[PDB]
Amino acid sequence: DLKAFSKHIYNAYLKNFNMTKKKARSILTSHTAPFVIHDIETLWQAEKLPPYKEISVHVFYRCQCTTVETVRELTEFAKSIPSFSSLFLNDQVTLLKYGVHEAIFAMLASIVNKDGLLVANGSGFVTREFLRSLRKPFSDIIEPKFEFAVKFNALELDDSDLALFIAAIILCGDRPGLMNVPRVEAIQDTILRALEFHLQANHPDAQYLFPKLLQKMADLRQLVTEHAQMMQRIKKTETETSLHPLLQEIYKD
Ligand SMILES: O=C(O)Cc1cccc(-c2noc(-c3ccccc3)c2C(=O)NCCOc2ccc(Cl)cc2Cl)c1
Numbered sequence: 001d002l003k004a005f006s007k008h009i010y011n012a013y014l015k016n017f018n019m020t021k022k023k024a025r026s027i028l029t030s031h032t033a034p035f036v037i038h039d040i041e042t043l044w045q046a047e048k049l050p051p052y053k054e055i056s057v058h059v060f061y062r063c064q065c066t067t068v069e070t071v072r073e074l075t076e077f078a079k080s081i082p083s084f085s086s087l088f089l090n091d092q093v094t095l096l097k098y099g100v101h102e103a104i105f106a107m108l109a110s111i112v113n114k115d116g117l118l119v120a121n122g123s124g125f126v127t128r129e130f131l132r133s134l135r136k137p138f139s140d141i142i143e144p145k146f147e148f149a150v151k152f153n154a155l156e157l158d159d160s161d162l163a164l165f166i167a168a169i170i171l172c173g174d175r176p177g178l179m180n181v182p183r184v185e186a187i188q189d190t191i192l193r194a195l196e197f198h199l200q201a202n203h204p205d206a207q208y209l210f211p212k213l214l215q216k217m218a219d220l221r222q223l224v225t226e227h228a229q230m231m232q233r234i235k236k237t238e239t240e241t242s243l244h245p246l247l248q249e250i251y252k253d
Pocket residue numbers: 037043059060062063064066067068105108109112117119126131141142143145146149231247
């Protein structure tokens with residue numbers, strides 16, 4: 001039953017991610033106010049990490065922290081869904097490795113907002129204007145994600161949808177190096193059907209939300225590809241930086 005499949009996943013989502021969209025959205029609106037980060041002053045105030053010699057590189061190390069923690073929650077999430085863990089440990093790793101960042105930007109969108117994004121599970125808010133004022137290499141690597149999130153959040157999906165959405169992303173039998181490609185495709189088609197079903201149910205007036213959402217899934221594949229290339233260049237031109245060994249493993253390709 002797809003209805004039972006969409007709920008089981010949704011709960012796996014509720015149990016593995018610290019920041020849900022429901023919560024994030026209310027903060028970015030009400031309840032209590034986050035600490036705004038817009039310069040050396042405030043960023044440290046908020047932190048009151050590898051060796052950094054400037055603000056830009058510093059923020060670079062921040063994002064990594066955010067993405068490492070997310071890769072962790074995503075692994076736990078990806079494991080909470082039975083079928084996935086049945087796959088060979090290798091492929092399990094493959095799926096995560098190549099789909100990890102797509103799952104990250106899609107969810108981070110839930111934390112994003114026109115003027116900035118929430119950090120440390122809502123504790124603070126890093127303004128977009130601050131990010132645009134960093135050395136060219138770093139300023140424009142974060143920006144694309146802002147434009148993506150904004151358009152993405154527009155489809156106005158909720159955690160119940162996201163749960164399925166990121167599942168359909170992590171379980172992509174199209175990643176390079178999969179052993180049992182067919183079994184992955186099998187699992188994904190179930191997810192995609194639970195996704196299909198669920199949407200038409202949860203958002204009945206959004207007629208093309210599904211084919212439209214699948215496209216956003218494509219924009220992410222593209223978004224990450226460009227991101228990896230920029231990571232590449234930051235590794236090549238900003239010899240002073242470095243990346244968490246975990247990210248070091250994911251960016252081996
Ligand atoms: O490649 C990695 O795995 C890590 C990495 C390295 C360099 C740039 C980005 C990257 N490019 O755009 C994004 C991005 C932008 C807007 C919304 C969502 C994502 C991020 C990203 O991972 N952001 C999360 C942390 O946001 C933080 C946290 C703390 C601070 Cl003080 C500042 C920032 Cl901006 C990620």
